Amino acid sequence: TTSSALKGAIQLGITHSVGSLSQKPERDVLMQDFEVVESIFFPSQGSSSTPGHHHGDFKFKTYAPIAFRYFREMFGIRPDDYLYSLCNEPLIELSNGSLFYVSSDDEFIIKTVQHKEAEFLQTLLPGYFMNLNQNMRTLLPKFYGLYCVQADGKNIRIVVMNNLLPRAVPMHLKFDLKGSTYKRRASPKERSKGVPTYKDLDFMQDMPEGILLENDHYTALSRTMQRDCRVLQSFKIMDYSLLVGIHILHMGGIPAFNSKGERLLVFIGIIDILQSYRSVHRPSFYADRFQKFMCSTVFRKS
Amino acid sequence: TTSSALKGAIQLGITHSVGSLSQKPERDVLMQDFEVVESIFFPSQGSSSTPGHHHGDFKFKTYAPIAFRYFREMFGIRPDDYLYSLCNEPLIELSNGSLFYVSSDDEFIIKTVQHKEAEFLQTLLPGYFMNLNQNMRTLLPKFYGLYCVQADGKNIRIVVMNNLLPRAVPMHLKFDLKGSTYKRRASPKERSKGVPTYKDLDFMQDMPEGILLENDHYTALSRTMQRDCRVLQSFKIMDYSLLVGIHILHMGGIPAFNSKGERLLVFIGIIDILQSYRSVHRPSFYADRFQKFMCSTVFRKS
Ligand SMILES: Nc1ncnc2c1ncn2[C@@H]1O[C@H](COP(=O)(O)OP(=O)(O)NP(=O)(O)O)[C@@H](O)[C@H]1O
Ligand SMILES: Nc1ncnc2c1ncn2[C@@H]1O[C@H](COP(=O)(O)OP(=O)(O)NP(=O)(O)O)[C@@H](O)[C@H]1O
Ligand SMILES: O=[Se](=O)([O-])[O-]
Ligand SMILES: O=[Se](=O)([O-])[O-]
Numbered sequence: 001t002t003s004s005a006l007k008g009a010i011q012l013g014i015t016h017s018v019g020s021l022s023q024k025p026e027r028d029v030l031m032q033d034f035e036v037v038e039s040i041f042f043p044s045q046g047s048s049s050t051p052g053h054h055h056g057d058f059k060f061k062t063y064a065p066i067a068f069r070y071f072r073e074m075f076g077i078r079p080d081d082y083l084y085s086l087c088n089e090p091l092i093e094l095s096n097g098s099l100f101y102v103s104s105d106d107e108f109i110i111k112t113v114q115h116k117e118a119e120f121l122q123t124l125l126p127g128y129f130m131n132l133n134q135n136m137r138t139l140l141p142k143f144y145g146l147y148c149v150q151a152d153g154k155n156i157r158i159v160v161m162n163n164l165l166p167r168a169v170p171m172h173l174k175f176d177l178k179g180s181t182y183k184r185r186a187s188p189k190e191r192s193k194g195v196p197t198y199k200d201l202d203f204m205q206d207m208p209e210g211i212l213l214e215n216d217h218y219t220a221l222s223r224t225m226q227r228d229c230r231v232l233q234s235f236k237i238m239d240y241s242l243l244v245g246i247h248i249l250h251m252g253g254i255p256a257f258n259s260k261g262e263r264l265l266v267f268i269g270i271i272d273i274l275q276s277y278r279s280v281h282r283p284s285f286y287a288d289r290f291q292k293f294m295c296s297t298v299f300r301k302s
Numbered sequence: 303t304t305s306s307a308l309k310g311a312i313q314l315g316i317t318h319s320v321g322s323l324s325q326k327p328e329r330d331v332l333m334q335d336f337e338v339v340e341s342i343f344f345p346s347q348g349s350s351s352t353p354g355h356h357h358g359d360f361k362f363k364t365y366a367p368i369a370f371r372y373f374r375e376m377f378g379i380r381p382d383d384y385l386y387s388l389c390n391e392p393l394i395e396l397s398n399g400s401l402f403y404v405s406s407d408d409e410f411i412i413k414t415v416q417h418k419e420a421e422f423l424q425t426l427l428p429g430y431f432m433n434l435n436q437n438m439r440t441l442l443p444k445f446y447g448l449y450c451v452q453a454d455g456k457n458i459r460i461v462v463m464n465n466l467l468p469r470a471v472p473m474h475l476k477f478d479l480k481g482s483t484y485k486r487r488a489s490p491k492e493r494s495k496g497v498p499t500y501k502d503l504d505f506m507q508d509m510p511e512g513i514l515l516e517n518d519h520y521t522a523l524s525r526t527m528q529r530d531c532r533v534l535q536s537f538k539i540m541d542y543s544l545l546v547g548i549h550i551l552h553m554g555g556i557p558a559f560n561s562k563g564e565r566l567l568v569f570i571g572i573i574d575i576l577q578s579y580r581s582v583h584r585p586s587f588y589a590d591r592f593q594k595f596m597c598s599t600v601f602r603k604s
């Protein structure tokens with residue numbers, strides 16, 4: 001593939017994009033700063049401006065940058081940290097349409113995106129900002145950046161964001177859960193893997209007594225889901241999953257207890273959030289199912 | 303006038319509007335909740351729903367209510383406090399187009415509004431929310447509510463908001479300042495009053511050594527203005543004033559020192575913010591003037 005080609009365009013492109021920013025002085029974000037999109041010409045020779053390269057000519061589209069500065073800021077992501085782990089350390093591909101990549105240090109993921117979505121996102125931002133500034137504990141994905149790359153005619157949109165499941169805490173059981181059932185078992189291929197990413201039925205089968213939760217924790221979660229749903233609902237959004245990482249242990253995640261009885265650090269985050277019908281009540285439905293499902297079956301009190 | 307008539311429609315209308323709310327349980331505010339507007343029919347007989355009255359038939363339009371609940375919440379305004387001081391204590395008129403009214407307890411003001419404006423406002427809200435959640439120390443007006451009343455054919459839009467200058471701290475000198483000069487002297491009529499509301503030139507005349515400020519305070523203000531301007535700018539907004547209340551003293555305001563040398567508690571807030579051209583650069587201009595003017599002439603460091 002022209003993949004390594006892209007991997008570069010990213011690290012070349014962002015480093016510029018962001019350093020570019022740390023010139024311009026800080027300022028609050030405005031309803032404008034969302035719609036904006038900046039481009040940068042990256043020739044294989046390279047101006048005294050866009051230099052370097054020998055990799056394959058492109059332009060680097062940076063999106064709503066002042067907004068994403070704000071978001072990083074609020075998610076506590078120092079630019080040098082961001083630039084480093086992302087740009088000065090080789091990017092590593094992944095099996096899963098939509099191609100993922102990962103930071104050498106397992107902190108950051110990179111989905112690609114249907115232009116359909118990328119545009120939706122832009123529109124979401126204000127809505128995002130609001131939820132973010134209100135449900136401080138939201139489960140929604142932490143969107144650190146949005147960028148497009150132009151490879152000849154071709155165009156690649158990508159989003160950068162928090163890996164929910166770092167190598168650090170090693171995950172034993174791993175589930176992608178929706179509250180639905182059609183094809184909601186992990187493919188033969190998938191099950192032939194490490195701590196492979198399961199699914200509703202596999203959970204339901206392999207874990208029918210549930211994930212037990214100390215009342216108070218069960219609430220924080222419950223309410224904070226019910227909040228995230230109500231957002232997503234409102235944005236006519238569907239197919240989202242709760243990604244869950246259980247870790248039996250023989251500190252930056254959730255405390256649980258077992259069907260047997262072992263203590264547990266669990267890790268979650270709602271995902272795949274950009275496909276938006278944007279029927280009349282259908283998302284409103286998918287939210288309630290997702291809700292009842294996680295907050296009744298997948299996690300339970302006492 | 304049919305004024306006392308209106309005074310009622312308000313207190314009758316809000317009390318319903320808000321109690322109406324304290325049923326529905328709390329929830330984060332969504333980009334939707336801004337656009338919404340609820341109405342309530344208030345007959346002079348009155349349903350078992352909208353009852354009471356003998357005052358003159360009307361409807362009570364309540365605006366973006368979940369947003370304004372949020373705002374009150376964030377400005378720390380407990381509904382019982384709000385309802386009481388506003389609805390269970392006679393409203394008091396005022397001289398100043400645009401009719402003001404005041405809470406018996408001097409906490410709240412009520413401007414009326416050109417439909418032109420009221421609509422602008424709605425649009426501002428998201429923008430408002432952002433600034434509010436970012437410049438915690440903004441000088442912008444604290445908008446507690448927006449309501450319209452329908453008196454026969456007639457329609458009255460009103461906004462409720464923080465009185466910047468309560469009876470509590472008695473204000474000695476009082477200025478309305480813009481950074482302009484045309485008609486920027488206080489009318490003969492006006493000067494024949496208590497601590498009458500002056501203006502640029504009167505300030506410039508009666509106070510040419512300025513309002514002195516302990517470095518650190520001068521900054522908090524300076525930066526926080528420069529922020530508010532940049533918002534307002536962005537909303538293509540003009541004719542705003544800085545309302546200033548100086549109090550010589552022989553604690554909820556700003557510390558200053560004098561041309562002579564007396565200690566001072568000063569009180570400010572940007573106002574008259576809804577008239578929006580919404581020329582190319584003109585607001586951007588009016589902001590910089592307003593800026594330089596307050597942060598150079600009206601307040602100065604050391
Ligand atoms: N933030 C994350 N942290 C950890 N793993 C993730 C994350 N995002 C995606 N993944 C992995 O990718 C899988 C699902 O991909 P997803 O994000 O749903 O996008 P997609 O390619 O559109 N899949 P779908 O559209 O549901 O078929 C998850 O089950 C995870 O195993
Ligand atoms: N929040 C407030 N606190 C104290 N006084 C206020 C407040 N708002 C308005 N006033 C008084 O009303 C005066 C100006 O009215 P303003 O709010 O500018 O609306 P307006 O009627 O549109 N005037 P303008 O449009 O500038 O001619 C101020 O100078 C104050 O004396
Ligand atoms: O997908 Se695209 O933007 O048409 O190349
Ligand atoms: O593959 Se599916 O039907 O979205 O779970």
Ligand SMILES: O=[Se](=O)([O-])[O-]
Binds near residue numbers: 417456457458
């Ligand atoms: O001012 Se209005 O709304 O036309 O009565």
Ligand SMILES: O=[Se](=O)([O-])[O-]
Binds near residue numbers: 484485541
């Ligand atoms: O009356 Se004026 O010209 O707006 O200060």
Ligand SMILES: [Mn+2]
Binds near residue numbers: 239272275
């Ligand atoms: Mn998907």
Ligand SMILES: [Mn+2]
Binds near residue numbers: 541574577
């Ligand atoms: Mn005005």
